[PDB]
Symmetry: C3
Subunit: 254 residues, 3 copies
């Protein structure tokens, strides 16, 4: 997997405009939808139990985010995940806060038991509670245990499936000043999984394309601030090119 192939995946996403069903928290629904629209995907945000099953089945990917949990939204997420599983739609999980509060950890473990996942994206603590050289081993152990793809996020991202491991070096710290920046990335990974057969490559391509857009947006923002960055990021998800990804994406097979 390289920058050249990641660029090709970004073009496939724009070409097909995949329907990406996201069940996420209310602090980031609007931004998640706008980021996906800018990227070139088709967002669908239904979250109620009376319809999530019908939505998930026709989507290109289902993304579950436990940011602002509730007993009911977790149940809807599982109903959606089971429907997605029945119809061969890939499911991506973002176990936000797993290990921080008991309810989050329980909900994350619940989903892992009831839904087969194509990929899980979270920080080291979140992945451990739900499931460097130490980060690489954690990613490999979890990927092998759940027979899935694990993307442990940080300034350096470690992605692993049952047999391979990669480190990615893209992005900008300004992403930490925009709420939903991480949540949107997991949905972008979903958009890529909807067009790329292998979830490991989809994830690498997704994280790389997003990090490049974020870097280019930060360059333009200069010292304007986090408000301008938020708008520039949406602009760059739309204007970032294959050439930009080939030139700035840093993908390393370990």
């Amino acid at each position: 997997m390289d920058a050249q192939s990641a660029a090709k995946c970004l073009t496939a996403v724009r070409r097909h405009s995949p329907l990406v069903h996201s069940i996420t928290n209310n602090v980031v629904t609007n931004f998640t939808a706008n980021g996906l629209l800018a990227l070139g995907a088709s967002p669908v945000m239904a979250y109620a139990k009376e319809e999530v099953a019908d939505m998930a089945k026709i989507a290109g990917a289902l993304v579950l985010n436990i940011g602002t949990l509730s007993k009911e939204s977790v149940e809807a997420m599982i109903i959606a995940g089971k429907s997605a599983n029945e119809h061969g739609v890939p499911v991506i999980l973002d176990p936000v806060g797993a290990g921080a509060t008991p309810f989050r950890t329980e909900s994350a473990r619940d989903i892992i038991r009831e839904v087969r996942l194509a990929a899980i994206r979270g920080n080291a603590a979140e992945i451990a509670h739900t499931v460097g050289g130490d980060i690489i081993r954690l990613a490999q152990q979890a990927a092998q245990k759940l027979n899935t793809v694990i993307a442990i996020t940080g300034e350096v991202d470690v992605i692993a499936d049952t047999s391979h491991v990669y480190t990615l070096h893209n992005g900008h710290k300004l992403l930490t000043k925009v709420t939903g920046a991480g949540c949107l990335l997991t949905s972008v990974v979903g958009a890529f999984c909807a067009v790329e057969e292998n979830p490991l490559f989809a994830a690498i391509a997704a994280i790389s394309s997003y990090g490049v857009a974020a870097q280019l947006a930060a360059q333009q923002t200069a010292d304007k601030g986090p408000g301008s960055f938020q708008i520039e990021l949406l602009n760059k998800l739309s204007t970032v090119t294959e050439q930009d990804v080939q030139e700035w994406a840093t993908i390393e097979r370990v």
Copy 2:
């Protein structure tokens, strides 16, 4: 109905700052409120059953949007609609997704039975499931059946009441890249219905003013992207003038 009269309606909205009660989905509440504030209206977003009745009764217009449905929010919408009906407050419905999932279609038909509507805005499929020359006939048939105003949206908008039909030619494709752009338009139609006696003229004036602002915003955005467009659209809802509407609104009586 013409561009000159539509411009006059826009000035009336700014003058009176109508209280527009919107019960909409969580992906677009913030944008809907901000668009209405920019336009010069007063948004009120209460959605809970314990208060929607009290809110609707003092509003200038009530707008119902079924974007991210739930059994409870539909019930609140009907409670609000009945209250609005009792106090002579016009009710506008946006039956998003009607015909796509069973639950949406059911909920839309439910509202149509329980609440008298001043106007319904949706795409062709949505209007048909809830209720060119073929689009014109659909709008006329539905307007006559429900004794209401039907605004079928597309690149060309077809608006009809029991006896008249109009086609409108305004707007920009960038609206498709901003979540809530359509939802906000239905609430803007509500803002216009709050000041214009005839719901057909209110709708025409609303859609025209919004399309002109969208075109002017797209000109300014140039090739910046969907992030800049979102911000420019809010800017133009605020700065668009009567002169702009007279010069760029395309209204045709069929």
Copy 3:
């Protein structure tokens, strides 16, 4: 309390990046989080009963906003407030709409009975229903009755604790065109209470710093509109300096 000391509080907030737990309405959650991130604080938006207690206990401040009430979210707010009270975490209340509808007034009075508050921020009507020279007396009467700090907002803000009263003269009218601008201010007051021992000084420092950032943002926005202002405000919460606060904050002890 002066502009020089208010500036020092702003630096303390940036230094410590306080965890500010906000339980607010869905129209303003994203903006509240982004404003706090821009300011230099750490927002946490959990609102479900199964976890709010665990969140509140580790936060630097808890802020309750009754904007889009529901029987359940009020109960969660009280659970969170009691947890905050047990662990010495300051609680700030924004009784939006108190006195406008019966349900709001009831909910506000409920919170006042069950949760000890460090500060309450609202307009004159809201403070009266929940609890010039006349505004000053209202603030003093309410502050003395509830043994708390009362910040009555307007173009001129009146802040009072059991024994002192201050008037603040900062801000810009463009704040009225951005949904969540007021709601975000109450959360900013929370961010300041998390680092400043005396809630009266924290509130004065918070409102002053926010008003200065708002004025500077309005200068930059010029005649661009409310969309650009929203983005500029976020920019200025990030870039406003101690020097800016010393030069533009107007604080008067009555």
